[PDB]
Amino acid sequence: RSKENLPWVEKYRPETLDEVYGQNEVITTVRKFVDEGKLPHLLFYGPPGTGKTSTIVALAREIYGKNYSNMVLELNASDDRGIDVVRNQIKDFASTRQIFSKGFKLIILDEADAMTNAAQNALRRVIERYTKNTRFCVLANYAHKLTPALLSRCTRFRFQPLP
Amino acid sequence: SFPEGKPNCLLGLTIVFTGVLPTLERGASEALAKRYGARVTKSISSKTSVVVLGDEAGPKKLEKIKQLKIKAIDEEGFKQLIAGMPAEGDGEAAEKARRKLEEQHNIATKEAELLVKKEEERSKKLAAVVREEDKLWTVKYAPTNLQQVCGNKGSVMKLKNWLANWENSKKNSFKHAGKDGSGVFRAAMLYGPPGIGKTTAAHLVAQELGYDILEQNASDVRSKTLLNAGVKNALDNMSVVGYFKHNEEAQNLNGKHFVIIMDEVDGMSGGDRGGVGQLAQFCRKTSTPLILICNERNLPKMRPFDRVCLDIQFRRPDANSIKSRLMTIAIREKFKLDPNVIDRLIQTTRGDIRQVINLLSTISTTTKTINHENINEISKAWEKNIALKPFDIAHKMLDGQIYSDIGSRNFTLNDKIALYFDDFDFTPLMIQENYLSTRPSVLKPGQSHLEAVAEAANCISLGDIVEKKIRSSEQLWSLLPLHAVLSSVYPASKVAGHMAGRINFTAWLGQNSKSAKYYRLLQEIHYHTRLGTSTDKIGLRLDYLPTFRKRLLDPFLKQGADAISSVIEVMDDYYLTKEDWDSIMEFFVGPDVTTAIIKKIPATVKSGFTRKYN
Amino acid sequence: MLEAKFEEASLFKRIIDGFKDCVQLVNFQCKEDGIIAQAVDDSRVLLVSLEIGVEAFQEYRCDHPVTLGMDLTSLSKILRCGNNTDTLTLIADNTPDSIILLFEDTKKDRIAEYSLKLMDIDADFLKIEELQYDSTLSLPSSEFSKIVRDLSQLSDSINIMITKETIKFVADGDIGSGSVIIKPFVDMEHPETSIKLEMDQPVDLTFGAKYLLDIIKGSSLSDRVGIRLSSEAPALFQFDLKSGFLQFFLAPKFN
Amino acid sequence: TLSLQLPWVEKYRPQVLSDIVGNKETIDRLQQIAKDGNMPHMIISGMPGIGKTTSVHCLAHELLGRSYADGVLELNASDDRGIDVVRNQIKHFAQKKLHLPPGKHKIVILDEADSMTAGAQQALRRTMELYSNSTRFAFACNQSNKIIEPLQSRCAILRYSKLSDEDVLKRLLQIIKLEDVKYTNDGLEAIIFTAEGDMRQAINNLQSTVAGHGLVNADNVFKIVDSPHPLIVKKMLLASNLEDSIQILRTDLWKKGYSSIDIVTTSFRVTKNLAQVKESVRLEMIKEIGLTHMRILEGVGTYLQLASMLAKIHKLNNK
DNA sequence: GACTTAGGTCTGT
DNA sequence: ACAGACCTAAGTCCTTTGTACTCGTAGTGTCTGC
DNA sequence: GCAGACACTACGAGTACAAA
Ligand SMILES: Nc1ncnc2c1ncn2[C@@H]1O[C@H](COP(=O)(O)OP(=O)(O)OP(O)(O)=S)[C@@H](O)[C@H]1O
Ligand SMILES: Nc1ncnc2c1ncn2[C@@H]1O[C@H](COP(=O)(O)OP(=O)(O)OP(O)(O)=S)[C@@H](O)[C@H]1O
Ligand SMILES: Nc1ncnc2c1ncn2[C@@H]1O[C@H](COP(=O)(O)OP(=O)(O)OP(O)(O)=S)[C@@H](O)[C@H]1O
Ligand SMILES: [Mg+2]
Ligand SMILES: [Mg+2]
Ligand SMILES: [Mg+2]
């Protein structure tokens, strides 16, 4: 393969925060956040193919390094959107420490607009209680699906269509 | 606006605010009348002292006024009326109300003194475990006997009588009902709105009659296995805690036996596997009294209990009964309460003495005087938001005042959507059933009733489309607010007005069940006739059944008892049964209805037909 | 305070396992005589009374009389933690909010302290008075357990009729019925297997099955059961201990 | 970096009951119960971020003193709050014996209580009354309608309201002074306007503005926090001419990346919450947006359908 | 300004 | 005392789907005792 | 080795779906 037998959409996926274009405001603000260390709970909402997943993956790569796939809880909310995930995986990950290196924890919830209302109503306190050691990232195409409570605990960034 | 008046100026006057008043709403007028001791009733009657109507009165109420010759005034007349009349109502009717108020105050003072004496006695005992202050106002003032329960006097008397002659009924083997008639049933249910003292009444009647009380929370214990073990074993065994509780004294023979007071029976699990239907089998065989208690008796999961229990409906106590109790608790607790406020408090709480108790307990911490100045805010902050019955949703939805220019500001469109969302399964059906039985009052200039009805029907059809899209394989529940407008709000706004007759229930459910049953029967007959008939389900009913009647029932009508064989032959030509014949004869409509015909064939022909077929 | 040291922790574990499936909450009143505790069943059909005297304990000290309100399931969980040969020391401080069970082994240096939070139970100290019993029986525990468990399968009722020199248990159920009859025999060679009868007046009584298996669950405490039967009075089932017993007061069905 | 600082929402959470700004009457009553004792069962309802959890926690801490560790039981929506927790955890906690100050009692705080199952809510009814002498239950929820009426009867109903701009300004000014942040009056006003009474969002947006740009100004705040979507939706709906409304939809909504479903839903909500337009006209425009919403949810989401919806609305307004 | 059914309390004959 | 007269509290009253959640029953595997 | 005994996992029936 060598990342060359892949579709151009996947092979040209950005790997660093400097290879994401268009959303310069969001990239600069988030880079400043992570440099000063005051990174809040993020909610990237925007149209498809505007570079939200790539942005958050590059952010995890920058903050944690090359081994970001073992030290960040990346959950596809479409595949698992139950309250059981909130009780079992998300909360255990947030509460405990890290097996690899010292630091805070990141939970990247992809397509959380599919998350059930019960799951979001459960997460609205998982986000608050463990704010000492973990931070939450919520990726959304549609913000109307998401509960209003989960839209008040996360700093909102809108991803504009690419100019 | 309204001039001030001397305290209790309007005392002893029965005032009905029928007419619409430009400056005050109906609630505001009622409040400003009850501030001065006036009595407000919903019905104009012979004893109605004055009727207040500025304009826009009702023809039925107007006819009542004309017949009863009741004096009437307007809003400006009411403003003049408030100031002029003297304090405390003078007139004999005012003297009667004065005597009643003084008597109630004396009873409150006497019972407060009695409570003080009891507290002093308890302090003397303690000097010689939880402190009384630590207890809640709801439990520290809980009734210790039947003579302190507020309201539902007949209900507590009936429960006492049933439990008293339960032993005699058991001796009579429950076959004889008795004079009161409660002895035939083996179990009794107390059902009503929450907090009207059902549990308290049951506990106190069981205490007075001497039986040993066993309390089970049916919500906590609802599974069939736990219910079975515990209370099945308890139904016919004696009480060890009762045998050791001085059986040697002979006053109480009921001390050994059990009274099982089951609370929150409405929380039982449903279904045949669930225990809600299994407990009826329990009541069908009991050697000890059973007192089930529930809030929502008219709930489908609770259907099996209908015939095996004595249903006793506890109703919301009227304010007059509870005034005395609130006065005693107010005199004891050193917070000032005036009687004129009391009524609205009950209306704020909807007859829940418990929540009135808690309301006073919470509010008296900071404000020590509950008076007419702050009662409006208390009501606005403590009002019970209870989901209305579908009949009430239909009544308010098809109301002219709601969709008028002035009424729209008071009740916004969002509130109408909320009324729909209270019950999202029946309001579309209730409006469809009762949008054509109202006299409209919002007809635009140049529009008749029929045009508004047609527009409403078109909107109901669009709402049915929206409902199908909502309630199909796509499950587009995000259209639920839209289905709120198209199905309920818009047609009701189109045909808003006064209710002509009564609010009927949705007939769609019953006819839908009938259609399902008839479709099932048609499937059985069609699949029986399939081997000969080359048709579908609908074609059989449309074409063959009219012809099948002429070859099945008409020979019985004309040629006589010798038709059976021939009928049997055609029966055996399509694998029909007697049930099949009865089903086919039940599918015809209009002119060809056979219900009267099958009665007119003589019983001999029917008996011969069944005998020959068998 | 209170410092009561058991010789062995298995005894308390078996005692609690005996009567933990019938009643859930208990009150252990610790007096200078020992630990007296009764529990009324939730159905209020059975009563359990337990006395463990000072002779049972290695070293029992109590300064002011106290009551410990306890949950049987939590105590069973705690007692399961200790080893069989450990010495369990119940230690309680003034105004008790928890009881500090202390398992300790003299062979090693392992010490295990478990604090069980005390439950607040409000119930009356109902007075217990003996009466002349028409029938008093002493039977092997394992035998009685077996008849009860065999008959409970067919039906939910156990009818004990003590006719002249005969004890018959009968169960009548929807599918099938069962009867087991025992004659009284006294064996000198083994006193344990002996069957002992006293019959002032013949008795017939029907008792609930579930409470009866709850009673037979105490078979581990003693080798022999003591059954006292009176027609109109609750039946006594006694499992005797070295310094006490596990008395069960059972209520028969209406007849 | 490895470590992160506390959010100002949690760092500056009120630790005493006096710090809570809005809903003065209820807070003063809670302070009076805090001093006197004997707290009744209560249900705290309102909108997100007006200090409901903080109020109950200040009350519980002040009541129970040093006994907060044992006398107070948290149950949250993140935990399992079925009938099992009422049978096993809640019942055992309420039966527990614990010696407290003469007036105070053990406290059960059930946060996010609106999501409790019907079975658990019904089972809690008798645990509330039987053990009330020792334990007092407290519920906090956004919607009081989800809690069953039998439970509502046994407790005092305290309803919180949206925070007025003045109280939000006071709290933000206090946080501004403690954290030495540079600000302008326009920036603070924009922050309150964007928060819309949600103090949590106000503090979060203030901290984000300070972190990203360094100065609380109108430009910076509006850059980091967008102007409300319902406002531009309302402006598009209430346009005098069709072309103006089309321009608003094209530039402010479609070109800025808002999805069609969002525009249609916000249009429906703005229509039903609008007051200047008469009810009949509002209902007919609601019908048109309902047709458009059906079309969008059927997969046809384009600028053309929204434009046709606006054209129909303008035809309806133009008679 | 909806119908029937029902309860609680008073006064008059 | 007794039916009537006021007044008020209340009852009329049961449909699927798609997927997530819950709760009790039924079934399974695995540890301990004899 | 052989049988129960709780304890975990699989199955099945009931209920609610929005907005603020
Ligand atoms: N800003 C961008 N800069 C560079 N490439 C981009 C950008 N946005 C999208 N792409 C390309 O498009 C691909 C998809 O990006 P994603 O971030 O996965 O899309 P998305 O923003 O997550 O939208 P979704 O997945 O529909 S919610 C990337 O792998 C890149 O190849
Ligand atoms: N009629 C009444 N008179 C006096 N006090 C009452 C009355 N009804 C209720 N109360 C008070 O309310 C407390 C609780 O009464 P309950 O009998 O539990 O009400 P409830 O009818 O059983 O409502 P539930 O439990 O929700 S079904 C009592 O202890 C009294 O303090
Ligand atoms: N009245 C207030 N005074 C001061 N800070 C407040 C106030 N209301 C909210 N906050 C801030 O907002 C944060 C969240 O408060 P909470 O009470 O947890 O929110 P909530 O009102 O309970 O709504 P939730 O959590 O969505 S159910 C607090 O920690 C404070 O920083
Ligand atoms: Mg993506
Ligand atoms: Mg009750
Ligand atoms: Mg909260």
Q: Where are the domains of chain D?
A: 1-163, 164-227, 228-319
User: Do the Cβ atoms of C119 and D95 come within 8 Å?
Assistant: yes
Alpha carbon dihedral D80, D84, D86, D92, in 10-degree steps, equals: -110
Rounded Cα distance between D53 and B612, Å, is: 81
Alpha carbon dihedral B6, B7, B9, B11, in 10-degree steps, equals: 180
Contacts of B471 (CB under 8 A, 6+ apart): none
Report how far ligand 5's centroid is from the alpha carbon of B195 (Å).
Answer: 7
Angle at D186 between CA D183 and CA D189, to 5 degrees: 100
**D208 close contact with C: CB closer than 8 A:** no
Structure tokens at B241: 């805690």
| DSSP summary character for residue A88 | I
For strands C166-172 and C244-250, give the pairing. Answer: unpaired
Alpha carbon dihedral B513, B514, B516, B522, in 10-degree steps, equals: 170
CB B206 within 8 A of CB B258: no
- Chain G positions with an atom below 7 A of a protein C-beta are 13-20
Q: CA–C1' distance B562–F19 (Å)?
A: 62
Rounded Cα distance between B606 and B594, Å, is: 15
Contacts of B280 (CB under 8 A, 6+ apart): B304, B305, B308
B427: closest CA among B459, B462, B388?
Answer: B388
- Chain F positions with an atom below 7 A of a protein C-beta are 5-18, 20-25
Q: Tokens 């609770």 — which residue?
A: B302
Contact D171 CB / ligand 3 (< 6 Å):
yes
State the best of D1, D2, D4 to mutate against chain A, taking most chain A CBs within 10 Å: D4
For strands C25-31 and C66-71, give the pairing. Answer: antiparallel
C140: closest CA among C104, C159, C165, C167?
Answer: C167
The interaxial angle of helices D185-195 and D199-212, nearest 10 deg, is 130
For strands C196-199 and C203-208, give the pairing. Answer: unpaired
| DSSP summary character for residue B586 | T
Rounded Cα distance between D239 and D237, Å, is: 6
Contact B93 CB / ligand 2 (< 6 Å):
no
**A132 close contact with D: CB closer than 8 A:** yes
Atom of ligand 3 at shortest range from CA of D112? 27
Resolution (angstroms) equals 3.7
Reduced to 3 states, what is the DSSP secondary structure of residue B185?
coil
Q: Which experimental approach was used here?
A: cryo-EM
Structure tokens at D81: 């709050």
Q: Which of residues 101-160 of D touch A (CB under 8 A)?
A: 111-112, 114-115, 142
Q: Which amino acid appears at position C142 of this protein?
A: S
* Spacing of C-alpha B166 from chain mean position: 28
CA dihedral sign, ordered B527, B533, B537, B540? negative
C148: closest CA among C68, C99, C214, C62?
Answer: C214
Contacts of D136 (CB under 8 A, 6+ apart): D39, D40, D41, D105, D106, D107, D108
Rounded Cα distance between C71 and B466, Å, is: 56
CB C172 within 8 A of CB C155: yes
CB B361 within 8 A of CB B136: yes
Contact D22 CB / ligand 3 (< 6 Å):
yes
CB C208 within 8 A of CB C180: no
**Which among D95, D99, D134 is the nearest to C95, CB-wise?**
D99
Strand partners, B15: B40, B50
Rounded Cα distance between D44 and D160, Å, is: 7
CA distance D1 to chain A (A): 6
User: Do the Cβ atoms of D290 and B469 come within 8 Å?
Assistant: no
- The best mutation among B139, B150, B196 to test binding of ligand 2, ranked by most ligand atoms within 8 Å of the C-beta, falls on B196
State yes or no: A52 annotated in a binding site: yes
Q: Tokens 């707290």 — which residue?
A: D39
- Asked whether strand E has any atom less than 7 Å from the CB of B391, the reply is yes
Structure tokens at A46: 């925007």
For strands A42-45 and A155-158, give the pairing. Answer: parallel
HEC string of B390-456 equals HHHHHHHHCCCCCCCHHHHHHCCHHHHHHHHHHCCCCHHHHHHHCCCCEEECCCCCCCCHHHHHHHH
Structure tokens at D209: 């503005």
HEC string of C43-77 equals CCCEEEEEEEECCCCCEEEECCCEEEEEEHHHHHH
Edge-to-edge, what's the strand order for the sheet holding B290-294? B212-217, B258-263, B290-294, B187-191, B309-313
CA distances from B66 to A77, B41, B45, B70, B75 (A): 71, 18, 11, 7, 20
Reduced to 3 states, what is the DSSP secondary structure of residue A153?
coil
User: Do the Cβ atoms of D272 and B413 come within 8 Å?
Assistant: yes
The interaxial angle of helices B339-349 and B375-382, nearest 10 deg, is 20
Angle at C27 between CA C25 and CA C33, to 5 degrees: 145
**D102 close contact with B: CB closer than 8 A:** yes
Alpha carbon dihedral D236, D238, D242, D247, in 10-degree steps, equals: -20
Structure tokens at C47: 């009563």
Structure tokens at C36: 């007296």
Main-chain dihedrals φ then ψ at residue B441, nearest 5 degrees: -135, 10
Contact B351 CB / ligand 2 (< 6 Å):
no
CB D137 within 8 A of CB D24: no
CA dihedral sign, ordered B561, B562, B566, B571? positive
Pick the residue from chain C with its C-alpha nearest to B247.
Answer: C233
Alpha carbon dihedral B428, B434, B435, B437, in 10-degree steps, equals: 180
Number of domains in chain A: 1
Rounded Cα distance between B104 and B339, Å, is: 10
Edge-to-edge, what's the strand order for the sheet holding C135-140? C66-71, C25-31, C34-40, C46-53, C244-250, C233-240, C224-230, C135-140, C196-199
- Asked whether strand E has any atom less than 7 Å from the CB of B117, the reply is no
**D130 close contact with C: CB closer than 8 A:** no
B158: closest CA among B311, B299, B304?
Answer: B311
Q: What's the domain range around A128? A: 1-162
Rounded Cα distance between B496 and B490, Å, is: 10
Assign residue C35 a region (left: φ > 0; alpha: ψ between -120 and 50; beta: otherwise): beta
| DSSP summary character for residue D311 | H
The interaxial angle of helices B198-209 and B153-164, nearest 10 deg, is 40
B25: closest CA among B54, B60, B62, B63?
Answer: B54
Strand partners, B293: B190
User: Do the Cβ atoms of D256 and A128 come within 8 Å?
Assistant: no
Q: Which amino acid appears at position A95 of this protein?
A: S
Half-sphere exposure for B263 (CA within 13 Å, toward CB): 24
CB A100 within 8 A of CB A67: yes
Strand partners, A109: A75, A138
State the burial class of residue B149 (Cβ atoms within 10 Å of its Cβ: 0-12, 13-18, 19+): buried
Structure tokens at B154: 């007949």
Main-chain dihedrals φ then ψ at residue B168, nearest 5 degrees: -65, -40
CB B103 within 8 A of CB B96: no
